Structures are given as structure tokens and as C-alpha cells.
Amino acid sequence: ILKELENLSPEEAAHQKAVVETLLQEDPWRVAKMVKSYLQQHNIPQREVVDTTGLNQSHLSQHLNKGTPMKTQKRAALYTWYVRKQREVAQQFTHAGRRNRFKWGPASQQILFQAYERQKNPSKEERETLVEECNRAECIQRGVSPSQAQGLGSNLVTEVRVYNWFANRRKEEA
Amino acid sequence: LSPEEAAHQKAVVETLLQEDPWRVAKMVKSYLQQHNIPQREVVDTTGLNQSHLSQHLNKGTPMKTQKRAALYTWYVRKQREVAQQFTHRNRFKWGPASQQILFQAYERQKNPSKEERETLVEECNRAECIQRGVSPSQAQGLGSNLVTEVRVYNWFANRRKEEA
DNA sequence: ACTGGTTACTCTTTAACGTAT
DNA sequence: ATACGTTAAAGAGTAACCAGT
């Protein structure tokens, strides 16, 4: 199939390895801040990095959040995962047109909190409207069309997830 | 042990189960913090879920009376053992009183000599015994929370690293 | 739908250990 | 000696699910 012919060419694969090599020459903290920002932008859990590369969860967490040091070879696996994952989510959205758990994005949480101030038990028509509003905002923060919301995958907002967020919030008001 | 003592234990569980659960939760959580008893110790001995217990102790998350009865039963029995342990598996836990002594000591010097570290061992062990209302002569009752010289060293080591 | 009770999952923190200057 | 490197353990926060209305 012509669409599956979008494997990696040798020249483009070498460019990936070159990026990883140039990343290892940069300051490790500055790259850690950029990888962490990417994980938050597309709500990619740190466990997916752990299960793929084999890095320790605490060492990865402390390296991304605090700047805890990490040897070159381990950082090379992190950067190799980063460059590979970027292309993977890139093709995931253009084709939209150990399963990870849904995570509420910060952009959607503001939309929900503002709806919570005006109604704590939203009807079905209010919940479904919030679904389209949240998935649009999540698509925007990723530099993606809202028409490609199917690419959100495990982080796609459903009507059921909106009800659970409101119900759990009412629980927190105690 | 004694029948009058065994009946007393069942009695206090009855009263505690007939009180506002949040009040007893703070009382149990304060006892855990006072003696630095890990919540994992409770989970292993009671069979309560780690998230449910932490949320019940911290936030007042609901918990059935049957589950609460297990937490209360563990609580009364632990107090008798802890008292016996001081009259005569768990990882070390720094107490809040000891940490203030170490903060001040760190403020003066960051790579303490084996002299100053052993002095701080005594100050922290005396400070931890005061927090639980025992005499400093019963510091061996601290068990897994007894302050040693290596533990003071790793505290200053890890804290120097946290400044970088 | 809803509250009440409940938890697997996820991640941060803690204390401790080993290794290379 | 001591900074650098590393992680098992511990616990808090999150999303979700069920039971009985």
C-alpha cells in the first residue's frame, strides 16, 4: 500500500540519529525541560517512556522535574525515544481525518471548572457540548486541527469522562 | 492480655466506631506521624487498600464500619506494643523534630565530620524521644526509626545534592 | 443519574546505595 | 573524601467503576 510506504528512509533515519547526537551535546537540563514540555503537551505518560526504553521511573521523573543527572547512554535512549515518538504522533494525526490511561489536559480542565461554577450536575446536552469544546482545545494546544481529534487516542474526551470529572469534583467539595 | 484488658480494647473500638470518623482519622493519622509508623505497616496487617487508607486518613474519604473496625483494632493493639517496646522490615523515617536540628546544623556546615555527626545522632534521638513522650534513655524503642551515624551522613549527602 | 464506597494506575518523594573522580 | 549516578520503597493524586437506589 502507498500509505504504508511511509517507513523511514536511510537518510531520514541518519538525521534522527544525528539529532540524538546533537541533543547529547546540549545541556541536559535544557533538553529535559523540552522533553517534559512535550510529554505535557500531548499528555504522554512517563510509564510509556519507562516500558519502551527501560529507564527507571524515579530516575526519569527526577531527571525531568529536578535535573537529576543521567548518564549519556541512558539519556541517549530517552532522546532516541523522543525523536521516534514525535514522528509517530505526527503520522497519527494526519491519518486520523499496555493501553495508556486518559489524562485530563490543562486546557480542558479550565473549560470544565468554568462550567462547574455555573452548574455542578450538567445535563447530557451540556456534557456533550463540553466534549466538543474540550477536544477542540486539546487539538489546539498540540498545533493540530480539531477535525483530527481522533488522533488524541487515549486522551480523547468522551461524554462519560466529563460526567466522571464533575461527579468526582462534587465528591471533593465533600 | 488480661480479660479486663482484653475487654477494654474491644470497648474503645466500640466508642471509636460510634464517633465522627474524621475525628478518629485525624487521631489515628496523628499517632502514625508521632511514631513514624508507615502506612504500609497498616495495609499489610489490616488488608485495607493503600489509596483508600491514605485518602481516609488525609481527606475523610468514606470507609465502611467493618473496614474502620479493622483500622481501629490495629490502632489500639499497636499502642500497647509501642508502649511495651519503649518500656523494655520497616524503613527508617526522618522525624520533623530531627530535621530542624539537621537544617540548622547544615546551615553552619555542609560536610559534617564524624564527630559532629555523632553529636547530632544524640540530639535527634533525644528530640525524637521527646516527641513521643518517652525518656531519652529508652531510645532503643525507636526501632526502625533509630537515628544512626550513616543516616545523618546520607541526609547531609542527599541534601547537598538537592542544592544542585 | 446519583451518592456512597472503592481501587488500579500513575507519579513524586524519600532514604539508601554504588561509582568515579 | 565527596560529587556523581541510581533505585526500591512509600505514599499521595487521578480516573474510573460498582451497588442500590
Residue numbers in the entry:
A (entry chain A): 85 to 181, 200 to 276
B (entry chain B): 92 to 179, 201 to 276
According to the publication:
Hepatocyte nuclear factor 1A (HNF-1A) and HNF-4A are transcription factors that engage in crossregulatory gene transcription networks to maintain glucose-stimulated insulin secretion in pancreatic β cells. Variants in the HNF1A and HNF4A genes are associated with maturity-onset diabetes of the young (MODY). HNF-1A and HNF-4A form a crossregulatory loop, in which both factors regulate the respective other’s gene transcription. HNF-1A binds to the P2-HNF4A promoter and activates P2-driven gene transcription.
We therefore recombinantly expressed and purified an HNF-1A construct harboring the DBD (HNF-1A 83-279) and crystallized the DBD:P2 complex using a synthetic P2 oligonucleotide. We refined the crystal structure to 2.3 Å resolution. Two DBD molecules bind to 2 P2 DNA double helices from opposite sides along the helical axis. Both the POUS and the POUH contribute to DNA recognition by HNF-1A. The majority of protein-DNA interactions are mediated by helices α3 and α4 in the POUS, as well as helix α8 in the POUH. Identical measurements with a P2 oligonucleotide revealed a lower affinity (KD = 304 nM ± 134 nM), which was in accordance with our expectations because of the noncanonical HNF-1A binding site in the P2 promoter sequence. A structural alignment of the DBD:RA and DBD:P2 crystal structures revealed a nearly identical conformation of DBD, with an average Cα atom root-mean-square deviation (RMSD) of 0.58 Å. The S.A12>T12 nucleotide change in the P2 promoter sequence leads to a conformational change of the Gln141 side chain, likely due to changes in the base interactions. The polar interactions between the side chains of Gln130 and Gln141 are maintained, but the Gln141 side chain does not interact with the S.T12 base. Arg203 in the P2-bound structure, however, adopts a differently oriented conformation, in which it appears to form a hydrogen bond with the thymine base of S.T14, as well as with AS.A9 and AS.A10 in the complementary strand.
